[PDB]
Amino acid sequence: AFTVDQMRSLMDKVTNVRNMSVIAHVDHGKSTLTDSLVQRAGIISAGITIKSTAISLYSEMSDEDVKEIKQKTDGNSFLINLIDSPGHVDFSSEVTAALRVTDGALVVVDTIEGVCVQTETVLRQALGERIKPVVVINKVDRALLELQVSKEDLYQTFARTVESVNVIVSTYADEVLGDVQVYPARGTVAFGSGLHGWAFTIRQFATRYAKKFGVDKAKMMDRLWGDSFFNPKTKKWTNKDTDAEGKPLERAFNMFILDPIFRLFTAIMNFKKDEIPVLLEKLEIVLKGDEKDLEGKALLKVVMRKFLPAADALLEMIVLHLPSPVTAQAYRAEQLYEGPADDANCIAIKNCDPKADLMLYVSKMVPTSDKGRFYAFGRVFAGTVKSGQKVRIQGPNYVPGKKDDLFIKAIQRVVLMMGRFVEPIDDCPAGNIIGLVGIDQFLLKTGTLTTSETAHNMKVMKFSVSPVVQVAVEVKNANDLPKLVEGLKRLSKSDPCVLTYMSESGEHIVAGTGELHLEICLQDLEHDHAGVPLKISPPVVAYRETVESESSQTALSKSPNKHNRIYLKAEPIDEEVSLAIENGIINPRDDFKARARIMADDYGWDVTDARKIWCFGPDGNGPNLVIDQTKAVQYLHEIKDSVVAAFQWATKEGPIFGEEMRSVRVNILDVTLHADAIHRGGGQIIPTMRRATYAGFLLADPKILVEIQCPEQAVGGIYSVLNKKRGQVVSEEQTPLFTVKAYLPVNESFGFTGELRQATGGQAFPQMVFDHWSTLGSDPLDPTSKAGEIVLAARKRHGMKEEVPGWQEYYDKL
């Protein structure tokens, strides 16, 4: 329990600060270990609550210990910030953000399960942030109590776990950091049981046996680990595991450190009441009062706490091995800073200079109980931030030259982020973590605060990574729409791999990396983010409605009045031309003359037809056209707007099942109008044109990028699956892996990710994006053909009649 003054004093000696977190796979004991740390060294102040985000620990080392610290030290007191990290381990950006504010990590590994993918994933991300690791092989009690494992087996298990870990480290750690691997002999590996208050270092035992073996501890701790044997028969220390006769010698670690512990466990747990007093006496352990009566685990717990007070082992590795900002910002400056390496701000970062201009990185926005207000959490890399200070808020898109994302505003208050609470403070110099109030509106997620107009902005760690699984989300109660729209924003910000957007059909879409990911997202969206009943339903694939040939016969339709008639034919527009329209070569607003010269000279069009295009559709710019081929219609000019409008309507909603048209050309052959405009009005001609277009369309023989990375030998599975799903290979490129690109119908992609791992031995990684467009040759009007099935499914899904109205339905015989 410290006062604000004591805390602030502790925060001045950043050489004696440790910013770190605990990395662990679910159930490996991350929680019980931190409870242990908190109960042993947690710090507390001598009605606003927050979600626990970080905890402060306090530790004192002996004068000799502090001498062993291979880094700048000021005194024997240490302040340890145990920073909370998310539990989602999908290489998410929320995790990367949390690690970014730490410098070291306590990696928890299970005695039995060893290093699992989740563990490798966070560690890999950590190494990517140049974080130094230290390991704790947890749940050791399981191997002794449940599995009855033997000493050499337990040893071997420990050694294999340590090797698995140093494989990940040696693979992803920056060579510039040197050897960041972990070594039990160097004290960077702890062993124990977070559930059961005892731990040790070889050093403590060396101290204990040095003045007893008549040898200095430097010599003793080297002998208490690895291949050092003490032959009781010769009374000598050797490095050979056998004697002259070749008989097996027990390792010094086993003989002097493990055996005493093993004997204590065995004697106490088996109630050997005549063997316990002696053993305790020999180890100089003293039971006082009610303790003398304890037995079994109760006695054990109490005896081990006295003999070797877990937290102690962990704190020792944290203080002695994890890195302290002055030291680190010297080699981290350039990465952290986008600007010039010779820049005034970069230098201020390298020197962790508190008198320079401000360089404060906003790690994330944290939820507060202050009615919808989020406080900015971050770290001062340069300068010092002050309450009421005028600063420059630069979002993710800011550039020193443009005024994008820029926001000048005063910082309302600078607060210490202590667990769920805050503590207003006047200022905070470079090298410290801190919270800012009043930045809510201008920044959401990461950012960069500066006090220099020149200041440039600041920068992120081996499952699917593409949002291939998507559903439509909608409120059950219309009035809730606002909360949903807001919830999606909140959801997107908290999840890097989550995607939300509005569909062509007006539905909010939420897409996730995999079925499970999407499920968490929807649960969180509904329960928290939006907090309102949501309705989930089918991603729907969009299709286009086109024609394969010219109308088999002139289309004829009359107006409601029955006085007006339009005669037309529909024909295919060449792909190259549709593409040209879609991509900017042939444009709706270009000068009709020059455009017609291009369409005629370069695309084979008849220049008169081209000069006479009346409009593009849908939306006035789509790849469908109306060309005027009439000769002597008197009031043509007066119906043009109605005809154009009807086309925008027809091409927007095709007659097959309501999808947009594409590559459809319509030629107006003739129009017969009533002499009086009353009759001829849009309300008469718009329906006529739309009815005729649908008819010409139906009479024209109507018709309606998956990137995979993987090893060579696995590629064969890819072709195997694709062939089972109307797939089609596109490209096979490459000394990393391979990358196969192919087209995969959307209605053949449900469960694809599963069948692919199954066919590639879990070695292939898919990625999918909507691509097109390809014309299906089957009949859209035949409920049993490939195209027809798709059309029948969409029609039922929309509550339309199953049978597709045929052309005769829009044809008005003369």
Ligand X SMILES: CO[C@H]1[C@@H](O)[C@H](O)[C@H](OC[C@@]23C[C@@H]4[C@H](C)CC[C@H]4[C@@]4(C=O)C[C@@H]2CC(C(C)C)[C@@]34C(=O)O)O[C@@H]1C
Ligand Y SMILES: Nc1nc2c(ncn2[C@@H]2O[C@H](COP(=O)(O)OP(=O)(O)O)[C@@H](O)[C@H]2O)c(=O)[nH]1
- Point out which residues bind ligand X (CB under 6 A): 467, 470, 501, 503-504, 509, 539-542, 746, 769-770
In whole angstroms, give the CA distance from residue 416 to residue 84: 16
Residue among 82, 95, 99, 707 at smallest CA distance from 417: 82
Cβ 467 to ligand X shortest distance, Å: 5
Tokens describing residue 554: 């002139």
Look at residue 503 and give the partner it binds from ligand X, ligand Y, none, a contact being a CB closer than 5 to 8 Å depending on partner kind: ligand X
Tokens describing residue 1: 């329990």
Look at residue 504 and give the partner it binds from ligand Y, ligand X, none, a contact being a CB closer than 5 to 8 Å depending on partner kind: ligand X
In whole angstroms, give the CA distance from residue 120 to residue 166: 11
Tokens describing residue 442: 């201008």
Q: Which residue has the tokens 């450190």?
A: 257
Look at residue 542 and give the partner it binds from ligand X, ligand Y, none, a contact being a CB closer than 5 to 8 Å depending on partner kind: ligand X
Cβ 311 to ligand Y shortest distance, Å: 13
For CA atoms 422, 425, 427, 430, the dihedral sign is: negative
Residue 618: cis peptide before it, omega within 30 degrees of 0 = yes
Look at residue 195 and give the partner it binds from ligand Y, ligand X, none, a contact being a CB closer than 5 to 8 Å depending on partner kind: ligand Y
What is the residue type of 627?
I
Spell out the residues 6+ positions from residue 269 whose beta carbon is closer than 8 angstroms to its own. 296, 297, 300
In whole angstroms, give the CA distance from residue 253 to residue 226: 7
Closer to ligand X by Cβ: residue 120 or 545: 545
Cβ 497 to ligand X shortest distance, Å: 11
Look at residue 329 and give the partner it binds from ligand Y, ligand X, none, a contact being a CB closer than 5 to 8 Å depending on partner kind: none
In whole angstroms, give the CA distance from residue 564 to residue 557: 8
Cβ 294 to ligand Y shortest distance, Å: 21
| 89 marked ligand binding residue | no
Q: Which residue has the tokens 């605060």?
A: 449
Look at residue 467 and give the partner it binds from ligand X, ligand Y, none, a contact being a CB closer than 5 to 8 Å depending on partner kind: ligand X
| 194 marked ligand binding residue | yes
Which positions lie near ligand Y, rule CB under 6 A? Answer: 24, 26-32, 138-139, 141-142, 193-195
Cβ 762 to ligand Y shortest distance, Å: 25
Closer to ligand Y by Cβ: residue 99 or 764: 99
Spell out the residues 6+ positions from residue 355 whose beta carbon is closer than 8 angstroms to its own. 383, 384
| 195 marked ligand binding residue | yes
Question: Can you name the residues that pair with 407 across neighbouring β-strands?
Answer: 393
Residue among 356, 417, 400 at smallest CA distance from 381: 356
For CA atoms 620, 626, 631, 634, the dihedral sign is: negative
Q: Which residue is nearest to ligand X (CB)?
A: 770
In whole angstroms, give the CA distance from residue 115 to residue 127: 16
Q: What is the CA radius of gyration of the chain?
A: 37
Closer to ligand Y by Cβ: residue 115 or 414: 115
Look at residue 788 and give the partner it binds from ligand Y, ligand X, none, a contact being a CB closer than 5 to 8 Å depending on partner kind: none
Cβ 191 to ligand Y shortest distance, Å: 11
Number of Cβ within 10 Å of residue 63's Cβ equals: 7
What is the residue type of 573?
I
Closer to ligand X by Cβ: residue 339 or 766: 766
In whole angstroms, give the CA distance from residue 499 to residue 460: 19
Closer to ligand Y by Cβ: residue 85 or 557: 85
In whole angstroms, give the CA distance from residue 762 to residue 752: 12
What is the residue type of 3?
T
**Terminal Cα distance for the chain, rounded:** 97
| 193 marked ligand binding residue | yes
| 721 marked ligand binding residue | no
| 475 marked ligand binding residue | no
Cβ 417 to ligand Y shortest distance, Å: 22
Closer to ligand X by Cβ: residue 403 or 772: 772
Cβ 541 to ligand X shortest distance, Å: 4
Spell out the residues 6+ positions from residue 342 whose beta carbon is closer than 8 angstroms to its own. none
| 26 marked ligand binding residue | yes
Give the SS3 label for residue 229: strand
Question: Angle at the Cα of 724 (from 718 to 730), degrees rounded to 5?
Answer: 50
| 28 marked ligand binding residue | yes
What element of type H or E holds 65? helix 63-68
Closer to ligand Y by Cβ: residue 193 or 513: 193
Look at residue 470 and give the partner it binds from ligand X, ligand Y, none, a contact being a CB closer than 5 to 8 Å depending on partner kind: ligand X
Give the SS3 label for residue 194: coil
Look at residue 653 and give the partner it binds from ligand Y, ligand X, none, a contact being a CB closer than 5 to 8 Å depending on partner kind: none
Cβ 651 to ligand X shortest distance, Å: 15
Look at residue 541 and give the partner it binds from ligand Y, ligand X, none, a contact being a CB closer than 5 to 8 Å depending on partner kind: ligand X
| 139 marked ligand binding residue | yes
Closer to ligand X by Cβ: residue 631 or 770: 770
| 259 marked ligand binding residue | no
What is the residue type of 314?
L
Cβ 705 to ligand X shortest distance, Å: 8
Closer to ligand X by Cβ: residue 298 or 705: 705
Q: How buried is residue 591: exposed, middle or buried, by Cβ count under 10 Å (0-12/13-18/19+)?
A: exposed
- Kindly give the interhelix angle for 296-307 and 259-269, rounded to the nearest 10 degrees: 150
Secondary structure tally for the chain: helices H, strands E = 26, 32
Closer to ligand Y by Cβ: residue 30 or 680: 30
Tokens describing residue 629: 């081929």
What is the residue type of 591?
D
Give the SS3 label for residue 487: helix
> In this structure, are residues 210 and 222 in contact, taking their beta carbons and an 8 Å threshold?
no
Closer to ligand Y by Cβ: residue 30 or 203: 30
Look at residue 369 and give the partner it binds from ligand Y, ligand X, none, a contact being a CB closer than 5 to 8 Å depending on partner kind: none
Cβ 486 to ligand X shortest distance, Å: 21
Cβ 67 to ligand X shortest distance, Å: 56
| 103 marked ligand binding residue | no
Closer to ligand X by Cβ: residue 192 or 623: 623
> In this structure, are residues 769 and 760 in contact, taking their beta carbons and an 8 Å threshold?
no
Closer to ligand Y by Cβ: residue 30 or 456: 30
Spell out the residues 6+ positions from residue 607 whose beta carbon is closer than 8 angstroms to its own. 596, 597, 599, 600, 601
Tokens describing residue 410: 């005063």
Look at residue 395 and give the partner it binds from ligand X, ligand Y, none, a contact being a CB closer than 5 to 8 Å depending on partner kind: none
Q: How buried is residue 168: exposed, middle or buried, by Cβ count under 10 Å (0-12/13-18/19+)?
A: buried
Look at residue 29 and give the partner it binds from ligand X, ligand Y, none, a contact being a CB closer than 5 to 8 Å depending on partner kind: ligand Y
Closer to ligand Y by Cβ: residue 199 or 759: 199
Q: Which residue has the tokens 């040209």?
A: 580
| 97 marked ligand binding residue | no
Cβ 140 to ligand Y shortest distance, Å: 7
Cβ 87 to ligand Y shortest distance, Å: 8
Look at residue 141 and give the partner it binds from ligand Y, ligand X, none, a contact being a CB closer than 5 to 8 Å depending on partner kind: ligand Y
> Which residue positions form the known binding site for GTP?
24-31, 138-141, 193-195
> Which residue positions form the known binding site?
24-31, 138-141, 193-195
